[PDB]
Amino acid sequence: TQNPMVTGTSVLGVKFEGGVVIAADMLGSYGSLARFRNISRIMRVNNSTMLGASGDYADFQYLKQVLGQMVIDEELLGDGHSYSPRAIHSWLTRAMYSRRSKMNPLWNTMVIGGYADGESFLGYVDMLGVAYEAPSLATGYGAYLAQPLLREVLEKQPVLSQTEARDLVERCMRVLYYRDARSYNRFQIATVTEKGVEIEGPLSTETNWDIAHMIS
Amino acid sequence: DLRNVCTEAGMFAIRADHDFVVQEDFMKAVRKVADSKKLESKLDYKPV
Amino acid sequence: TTIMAVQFDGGVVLGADSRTTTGSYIANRVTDKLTPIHDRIFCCRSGSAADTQAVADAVTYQLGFHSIELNEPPLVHTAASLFKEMCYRYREDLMAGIIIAGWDPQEGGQVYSVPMGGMMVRQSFAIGGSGSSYIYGYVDATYREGMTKEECLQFTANALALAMERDGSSGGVIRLAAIAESGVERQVLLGDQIPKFAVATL
Amino acid sequence: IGTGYDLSASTFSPDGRVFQVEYAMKAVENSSTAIGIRCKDGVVFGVEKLVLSKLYEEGSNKRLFNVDRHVGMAVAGLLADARSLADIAREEASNFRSNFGYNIPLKHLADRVAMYVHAYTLYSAVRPFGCSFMLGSYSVNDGAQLYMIDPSGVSYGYWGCAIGKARQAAKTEIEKLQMKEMTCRDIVKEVAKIIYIVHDEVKDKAFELELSWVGELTNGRHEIVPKDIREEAEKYAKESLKE
Amino acid sequence: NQYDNDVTVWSPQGRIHQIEYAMEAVKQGSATVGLKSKTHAVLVALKRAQSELAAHQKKILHVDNHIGISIAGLTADARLLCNFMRQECLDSRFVFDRPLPVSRLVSLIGSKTQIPTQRYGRRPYGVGLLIAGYDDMGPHIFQTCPSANYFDCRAMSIGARSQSARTYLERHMSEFMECNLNELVKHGLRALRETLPAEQDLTTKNVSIGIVGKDLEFTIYDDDDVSPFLEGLEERPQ
Amino acid sequence: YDRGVNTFSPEGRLFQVEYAIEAIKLGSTAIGIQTSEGVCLAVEKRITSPLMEPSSIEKIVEIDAHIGCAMSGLIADAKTLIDKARVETQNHWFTYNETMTVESVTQAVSNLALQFGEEDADPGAMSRPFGVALLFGGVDEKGPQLFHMDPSGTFVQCDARAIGSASEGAQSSLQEVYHKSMTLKEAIKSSLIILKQVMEEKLNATNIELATVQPGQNFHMFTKEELEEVIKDI
Amino acid sequence: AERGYSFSLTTFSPSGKLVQIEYALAAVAGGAPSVGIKAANGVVLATEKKQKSILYDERSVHKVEPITKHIGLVYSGMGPDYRVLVHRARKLAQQYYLVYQEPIPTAQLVQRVASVMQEYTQSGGVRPFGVSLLICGWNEGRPYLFQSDPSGAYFAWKATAMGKNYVNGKTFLEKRYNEDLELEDAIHTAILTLKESFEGQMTEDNIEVGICNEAGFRRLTPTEVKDYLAA
């Protein structure tokens, strides 16, 4: 992909005690046009990992396909081995990098969340193959709007409960709805705990517009 | 090959113990009778 | 170009304008943009005419062979997936916006969008083409869950009429086709049959 | 048949036979027995897995394979060949998914893999596969299905089927079941039973029973029979063996 | 005799003679034994020398930090497969950043070795392997034949006069799962010892040991690093 | 009858590899001795006529400044392996900036072992094994090493080894006279003695070739005079 | 998986014969007979299309095939091989026409076809074609009649016969036929020389005839063949 077409905007992630939460609005934008206002930008990849993607939705679908096939191929063996979130992140990094180095990149920015072996995992993969781990992640405008808040919290209270994390995510998605002109008040939250991957249906953000009466 | 089929089953019949044959000592034979029939390559030969 | 597809209970409803342009000139004022991919799967084309025709041919080929090899009427999702594979793999050399819509004994009436990038999503209703931009409003305010076949027919007819009115790259005649287990019902809405809207004067 | 008509798969015998394929089949015949039986809500697989040494682990040399998440495979014969065919089947299923969007229909996977097997019975440059295998699947849109494939490339649909040494005996035991009305649950016991019957404790030493589900009880996923149901069926079998 | 020279030729009795003859190449190799506890996997190998003034053939090879192998057969085929296994392990670490599960590596070896048993003028790999490894499912000992078949073993031995070792191991299986490392290596050394006439015995010159475990990367001991294991054995007398 | 070049015998052996081993038994005999002071290599030239210039007989070559090689059997086949060895040493120096270990070079040459075969291969790939035995003699970080290689591809380190037609005799003779504390002088002396025992013609300065590699001195092929000085002390 | 045998199956005997070629020729001289006559103002090819049952539909396969608009073909020997050669000859003809925008000369098509036949006596893993071809053509005013055999060699004939009894047919042609013959008389003597073998009642569906005058090559309709076979 040299020219992205239908795109999704920011994706959020935050670690908490014994789990990870990821959020993403359900919009595919064609330029400025909110053309598909009901697509998911989150995938369940096995039981201990999940993926969220900003950027070109077609390339995201391709990665969704490939990844799915990889997981199926592996679960066919039944050797009591399964892809760890770090392994999926590694793979994804090498993939993006390889396409980047062929000058035909996958125009995605992706957030991988997972829980395995008692540890939370949250990884970011660029379309250039810039990859890293962090306690909080935000793609796109989320890196300029949401991540200041998320970092502010996580450097005053490093360990969050699932509830604190969900609240945090709702507030960040709210900020995004206020300031990102290609976002949507209808988003998904996915959570990975030891119970598995749960993907909560279309959620709305409550908004305040009292400053509309502070013109004069 | 059919007669044998009877005779074969008959050995199952006499076999173990059941003076009275059934539908069991039949098929067993039948395939059995059609099993070894693999050792008979070319059993047809027309004239001129 | 303005293409449209609505799902109802027994099946689907397709519509398109008939104008194919090269610049501001109308090379074909009476184009058929609804293309049968199988006996009960149709595709609506938009974008490059060469590209869409080529891809439609290719998918027709593949899906034909597949349906013969399974001896079953193909799934709509299957046609859509094949279009999606070609439109994605060659996204840098194709400009095609496809709407695959049809009926299928396994999932009933369905509509899938394959816009230019090569993504695929199922939709209750879909629009595409240059003129589509101008009827997002109407189609958003008029749509309603549980329309009858005739209702959907009137719906697409009106929407296409509006788009044709506003978009210069759209016009001519409207082509409809309803698809259900019954079969394919095509009609052509021309001249006075096309819904009119009283235009503001003073 | 030191005649030369039996050294290659590219060579017909003067009575119109390909003897290499027959000899491959014969390699299958010398293998331990595996059976599979289709009922009204799925397919059950059973394998008589002969233990050649106490040094082998429990669950070594599995002869039940997951070809796709909805398709299980049961083999008999030269095991290398069977593994290679499992990989081929897997890849056929994968490619199908990626190109057409859905899980591969069993009849089609069977046709494909069997055409792949048949492709090896035409030339001198390769040898026919010394294995026969069964494919089982269950879907709500197609039902329960069971196919078997032999070294010649023949693929047939079955209600009940067996491969290996005691093919025919097993079939005779199977025809006494009314599986078109029974459920997989009831069937597992009967499979284990038929295995225990067919097994020859004199010629063959000790053995281990492999069992596979695939049906409405597993939501379409081909799975291994739990240790619980397995031991239950084994007990039922041992006790049914005393009569 | 017309069914003897090609791998693509089934015999009229359902066998492939080049594969079997290939399997006989494993028996030509010096014996090697592989056993596991619940935490460790141990290869013990009887090295072997041409003349007294020549060093002993190495018999245990390092593949990855968690996987080592013991070879029996054509050394060139051994090295071929060994390079393939090392490459696969490196590919796995490169792409996934996790060590490659032993069972998958073995499956790859099966796939690789099956191919030449089906194409004309190709020959099967004339080498048998014992693979000792540790992953998320614990210790493993696998066995690979030239027939491209493989087995998951609880303990095993291959090579010339390995039947003896097979018998001994078959006696003391029940002990192994609870043994400590020293006792495990001991058992392997005894198994290996029963594969010799009463005239000759184990030495620090013709024995190699290899260990991998939950708290131990794969390691090879030979020369003087073996002596602490040997000096701790019962001088089994005829 | 005709079978393939990649056929096994029922006994477990590749007939081509065995036959190649047989082909070595016809080569000129060579002796290599490893010693803490260096490694020595001697080989008989087997001149078939006084008209043949013996200086154009080299069964001893320099793979690199610290690795020499003595060859027996089909010399023409040896040339290819020697070239591949040289190139390999130089590539390793190129890439890592350090010399090759004798064991690594040996291994590299030994990888061209069983690389022969008919169908399913390149049009320029080998039709048969190399009918040659090699003795690599070098000095590295582990000190003086000597390896032996045969067409089986098995290479093995050796203290003192003989290859060639008089392999058995010379090897026995070597066993009778070798200990891991000889001087290089004793090694060369021994080698020339055994060589004289097994050689068909009378041993002289233009009848064998002799080379040493010592830790402080690069590969050295003995000149005529340097040979004479040693043969003098028979 | 598959490759191709790379060695020749056609090899010199110690006598210096290419045995496979002569055995291929044996296969030719076992097929239904065909006669070809070049006759001043045109060319006639005829062959015995005698089936083995009322069940076979004679209006489905033909033995006298057009290669282009001005060149025609018949064969003796194996059917399938003929089919292959006819496809290939049409292809060659069309290559020539793409390049020179002029219909291929009969001699050149004969050359090319013959080259194809020769390839399968030297390329690997194959047998030679078991077919002799008679190729008629109209080019440059004159008519043309060539024969190509499985060796890949070709000869120009005024008239000739191939297939069973080709020797007696050949002699009959040498006697009961000469130049200054119109196409009609040539058709006559062609059916006459074919009748020197046609065991049975020669019907209009038992034989196939093609002509090639300076109006193009064409197959005679069954009607026309009936009218001619009224003699």
Sign of the four-CA dihedral D83, D85, D87, D90: negative
Where does chain E have alpha helices with state H?
17-27, 75-96, 102-114, 162-171, 173-176, 181-193, 227-230
Which residues of chain D from 101 to 130 reach within 8 Å of chain A, CB to CB? none
Please spell the DSSP secondary structure of F57-95, one letter per residue: --SEEEEETTEEEEEEE-HHHHHHHHHHHHHHHHHHHHH
Instruction: State the resolution, in angstroms.
Output: 3.5
Residue from C142, C102, C137 nearest C122 by CA: C102
Cα dihedral sign, C154-C155-C160-C166: positive
Letter string b/e over residues G122-160, b meaning 16 or more CB atoms within 10 A of that residue's CB? eeeebbbbbbbbbbbbbbeeebbbbbbbbbbebeebbbb
Classify residue F9 by its DSSP letter: P
Chain C contact partners (≥3 CB pairs within 8 A):
A, D
* Alpha carbon distance D148, D28 (integer Å): 13
Pairing type for strands A119-125 and D207-215 reads: unpaired
C-beta separation of C161 from C15 below 8 A: no
Helix, strand, coil content of chain B in percent (nearest 5): 60, 0, 40
Q: Give the Cβ contact number of residue D223 at 10 Å.
A: 17
Backbone angles phi, psi at G59, to 5 degrees: -100, 30
What single DSSP character describes residue F176?
H
Collapsing DSSP to helix, strand or coil, F35 comes out as: strand
**Break-preceding residues in chain E (C–N over 2.5 Å):** none
Taking the C-alpha atoms of residue B14 and residue D211, their distance in angstroms, rounded to an integer, is 36
> If DSSP codes are grouped into helix, strand and coil, which group holds residue A39?
coil
Q: Does B31 touch chain D (CB under 8 A)?
A: yes
Q: Do C115 and A1 touch (CB under 8 A)?
A: no
How far apart CA D118 and CA D129 sit, in angstroms, is: 9
Q: For residues G13 and G19, is the Cβ–Cβ distance under 8 A?
A: yes
Q: Measured between CB atoms, does D105 come within 8 Å of chain C?
A: yes
In 3-state terms, what secondary structure has residue E219?
strand
Tell me the residue range of the domain where C178 lies: 1-202
Q: Cα separation of A12 and A176, whole Å?
A: 10
A191 catalytic, yes or no? no
Task: List the single residue in D7, D60, D130 with the smallest CB-CB distance to E151.
Answer: D60
Phi, psi at G188, each rounded to 5°: -55, -60
CA–CA gap between residue E67 and residue E220 (Å, rounded): 11
Of F156, F154, F162, F157, nearest in space to F70 by CA: F162
- Asked whether G194 and G32 are in contact (CB, 8 A), the reply is no
* Mutation target among A2, A3, A5 for the C interface, most CBs of C within 10 A: A5
Q: Do D99 and C78 touch (CB under 8 A)?
A: no
- Interchain touch G–D (≥3 Cβ pairs closer than 8 Å): yes
Q: How far is D123 from chain G (nearest CA, A)?
A: 7
SS3 E152: strand
Query: Could you tell me if A162 and A173 are in contact, meaning their C-beta atoms sit under 8 angstroms apart?
Result: no
As a whole number of angstroms, the distance between CA F130 and CA A119 comes to: 57
CA nearest to D138, candidates D44, D62, D34: D44
Residue with tokens 């031995």: E157
Asked if the Cβ–Cβ distance from E3 to D54 is below 8 Å, we say no
List strands edge to edge, sheet with E32-36.
Answer: E155-158, E32-36, E40-46, E207-213, E216-221
Tell me which chain A residue has its CA closest to the CA of residue E136.
A81
* Sign of the CA dihedral running D3, D7, D12, D13: positive
Residues D66, D81: Cα–Cα separation, whole Å: 16
Q: Is G222 exposed, middle or buried (0-12, 13-18, 19+ CB in 10 A)?
A: middle
Contact between D195 and D35 under an 8 Å Cβ cutoff? The reply is yes
Place of tokens 């290559």: G95
Write the secondary structure of chain D as one string of H (helix), E (strand) and C (coil): CCCCCCCCCCCCCCCCCCHHHHHHHHHHHCCCCEEEEECCCEEEEEEEEECCCCCECCCCCCCEEEEECCEEEEEEECHHHHHHHHHHHHHHHHHHHHHHCCCCCHHHHHHHHHHHHHCCCCCCCECCCCEEEEEEEEECCCEEEEEEECCCCCEEECCEEEECCCHHHHHHHHCCCCCCCCCHHHHHHHHHHHHHHHCCCCCCCCEEEEEEEEEHHHCCCCEECCHHHHHHHHHHHHHHCCC
Measure the CA–CA gap between E8 and E5, rounded to whole angstroms.
9
Nearest Cα neighbor of A83 from E100, E106, E139 is E100
Rounded distance, CA F16 to CA E81, Å?
Answer: 21
Nearest to F28 by CA among F128, F132, F154, F110: F132
Beta carbons of B31 and D168 less than 8 Å apart: yes
Q: Which chains touch B (3 or more CB pairs under 8 A)?
A: D
* Residue showing tokens 């191919």: E115
**Method of structure determination:** cryo-EM
**Cβ distance of A81 and E136 shorter than 8 Å:** yes
Asked if A131 contacts A89 with a C-beta cutoff of 8 angstroms, the reply is: yes
Contacts of E209 (CB under 8 A, 6+ apart): E42, E43, E44, E45, E60, E185, E188, E189, E220, E221, E222, E226, E229
Alpha-carbon distance F110 to F228, whole Å? Answer: 35
CB A108 within 8 A of CB A60: yes
**CA-angle at G224, arms to G218 and G226, nearest 5°:** 135
CB-based contact (8 Å) between D169 and chain B? yes
Q: Chains with ≥3 Cβ pairs under 8 A against E?
A: A, D, F
Q: Distance from E178 to chain F by nearest Cα, in Å?
A: 39
Q: Is D231 on the interface with B (CB under 8 A)?
A: no
User: How wide is the angle at C-alpha E47 spanned by C-alphas E41 and E53, nearest 5°?
Assistant: 155
Nearest to E59 by CA among E186, E226, E181: E226
Judging by beta carbons within 10 Å of its beta carbon (0-12, 13-18, 19+), is residue G9 exposed, middle or buried? middle
Cα gap F97→F89, rounded to integer Å: 11
Q: Are D211 and D169 in contact (CB under 8 A)?
A: no
- Cα separation, C61 vs C59, in Å, equals 5
Measured distance CA(E79)–CA(E75) in Å, rounded? 6
Coil, strand or helix at E181: helix
Q: What DSSP character marks residue A212?
A: G
Q: Look up residue F117 and give its amino acid.
A: G
CA G36 to chain centre: 8
Calpha distance E80→F8 (Å, rounded): 18
Of D102, D108, D111, the CB nearest to C77: D102
How many residues appear in chain C? 202
φ/ψ (deg, to 5) at F75: -55, -40
- Asked whether C74 and C41 are in contact (CB, 8 A), the reply is yes
Alpha carbons C145 and F205: distance in angstroms, whole number = 107
Q: List the domain boundaries for chain E.
A: 1-234
Q: Which two tokens stand for residue A190?
A: 């996915």
User: How many alpha carbons fall within 13 Å on the CB side of residue D58?
Assistant: 3
**Chain D hits for B12, Cβ within 8 Å:** none
d(CA D92, CA D67): 9
Choose the CATH number for A1-216 among 3.90.470.10, 3.30.365.10, 3.60.20.10, 3.30.70.20. 3.60.20.10
Distance CA A65, CA E127 (A): 39
Residue numbers of C annotated as active site: 1
Contact B42 D175 (CB under 8 A): no
**CA atoms of C6 and G211, how far apart (whole Å):** 64
Residue B30, min C-alpha distance to chain D (Å):
10
**Strand-strand pairing, F30-35 and F38-44:** antiparallel
- Distance, CA of F8 to CA of E21 (rounded, Å): 6
The DSSP letter of residue F210 is E
Q: How far apart are CA F40 and CA F217, in angstroms?
A: 13
A37-66 as b/e, with b when 16 or more CB fall inside 10 Å?
Answer: eebbbbbbbbbbbbbbbbbbbbbbbbbbbe
Which one of D26, D55, D75, D90 makes the best mutation probe of the E interface by having the most chain E beta carbons within 10 Å? D55
Distance, in Å, from the CA atom of A120 to the CA atom of A114, rounded to the nearest integer, reads 6
Task: Please name which of E46, E48, E105 lies closest in space to residue E81, comparing C-alpha atoms.
Answer: E105
Are residues F26 and F74 in contact, defined by beta-carbon separation less than 8 angstroms? Answer: no
Q: How far is the C-alpha of F43 from the C-alpha of F166, rounded, in Å? A: 11
Three-state SS for F162?
A: strand
CA distance C146 to C83: 28
Distance between CA atoms of residues G26 and A202, nearest Å: 82
**The CA-based dihedral angle spanning residues A178, A182, A186, A189, taken in that order and rounded to the nearest 10 degrees:** -90
Q: Which residues contact C114 (CB under 8 A, 6 or more apart)?
A: C80, C83, C84, C87, C96, C97, C98, C99, C100, C120
For residues D105 and D88, give the distance between their C-alpha atoms in angstroms, rounded to a whole number: 16
Answer for the pair E201, E224: CB distance below 8 angstroms, yes or no: no
Distance CA D128, CA E9 (A): 9
The helix (run of H) or strand (run of E) holding residue A189 is strand A187-193
Tokens of F89: 């040493």
In chain A, whose CA is at the least distance from the CA of D72?
A76
The H or E element that residue A124 is part of is strand A119-125
In whole angstroms, give the CA distance from residue C153 to residue F212: 98
A69 → closest Cβ in D66, D94, D224: D94
Looking at the 3D structure of chain C, how many domains does it have?
A: 1
Residue E1 contacts by C-beta under 8 Å, 6 or more apart in sequence?
none
Chain F contacts of E6, Cβ < 8 Å?
Answer: 3-4, 7
For residues F92 and F146, the answer to whether their CB atoms sit within 8 Å is: no
CATH code for the domain of F7: 3.60.20.10
The one-letter amino acid code at C119 reads M
The minimum CA-CA distance between C182 and chain D, rounded to whole Å, is: 21
CATH architecture of E1-234: 4-Layer Sandwich (3.60)
Measured in degrees and rounded to the nearest 5, phi and psi for residue G85 equal -60, -30
| CA distance to partner chain C, nearest, from residue A3 (Å) | 8
What is the token pair recorded at E173?
Answer: 């299986």
Rg (CA), chain G: 18
Task: List, in sequence order, every residue forming a beta bridge with C26; answer none if it has no partner.
Answer: C21
Q: Tell me the domains of chain D and their CATH numbers.
A: 1-240 (3.60.20.10)
> What residues have CB less than 8 Å from G171, skipping those under 6 apart?
none
What would the 3-class secondary structure string for chain C be?
CCEEEEECCCEEEEEECCCEEECCEEEECCCCCEEEEECCEEEECCECHHHHHHHHHHHHHHHHHHHHHHCCCCCHHHHHHHHHHHHHHCCCCCCECEEEEECCCCCCCEEEEECCCCCCEECCEEEECHHHHHHHHHHHHHCCCCCCHHHHHHHHHHHHHHHHHHCCCCCCCEEEEEEECCEEEEEEECHHHCCCCCCCCC
Q: Which amino acid is at E208?
A: S
* Matching residue, tokens 């060139």: E76
Ramachandran angles phi, psi of B7, nearest 5°: -55, -40
D126 contact residues in G (CB cutoff 8 A): 1
Placement of tokens 């509309």 in the chain? A212
Rounded to 5 degrees, φ, ψ at C95 are -125, 85
- List CB contacts of E180: < 8 A, sequence separation 6 or more: E37
CA–CA–CA angle F151, F157, F159 (5° rounding): 120
| Nearest partner of F14 among A171, E125, D128, G204, judged by Cα | E125
Separation of alpha carbons E192 and E208, rounded Å:
11
Retrieve residue F186's tokens. Answer: 């004793």
Round to whole Å and give the CA distance between F6 and E123: 6
Host domain of residue F174: 2-234
CATH number of G3-231: 3.60.20.10
Pick from D40, D27, D219, D22: nearest CA to D146: D40
Q: Is D126 on the interface with G (CB under 8 A)?
A: yes
Structure tokens at E150: 């493989």
CA C13, C14, C16 angle in degrees (round to 5)? Answer: 150
Torsion angle (degrees, nearest 10) of CA G11, G74, G188, G156: -50
Q: What's the structural domain count of chain F?
A: 1
Task: Report the CATH number that the domain containing residue C131 is assigned in CATH.
Answer: 3.60.20.10
Closest CA to E34 of E135, E138, E156: E156
Length of chain A: 216
Query: How close is the nearest chain C Cα to the Cα of D92, in Å?
Result: 14
**Residue E142 near residue E106, CB atoms below 8 Å:** yes
Nearest to F60 by CA among F230, F208, F192: F208
| Phi and psi, residue F220, nearest 5° | -125, 120
Here the tokens at position C176 are 């409809």
Contact F176, F183 (CB under 8 A): no
F72 vs G53: CA distance, rounded Å: 76
What distance in Å separates the CA atoms of residue F70 and residue F136, rounded to the nearest whole number?
A: 7
CA geometry: angle at C76 spanning D137 and D113, to 5°?
35
One-letter-per-residue 3-state SS of chain G: CCCCCCCCCCCECCCCCEHHHHHHHHHHCCCCCEEEEECCCCEEEEEECCCCCCCCCCCCCCCCEECCCCEEEEEEECHHHHHHHHHHHHHHHHHHHHHHCCCCCHHHHHHHHHHHHHHCCCCCCCCCCCEEEEEEEECCCCEEEEEECCCCCEEECCEEEECCCHHHHHHHHHHCCCCCCCHHHHHHHHHHHHCCCCCCCCCCCCEEEEEEECCEEEECCHHHHHHHCCC
In our burial notation (b when 16+ CB lie closer than 10 A, e otherwise), range D177-208 reads bebeebbbeebbbbbbbbbbebbeeeeeeebe
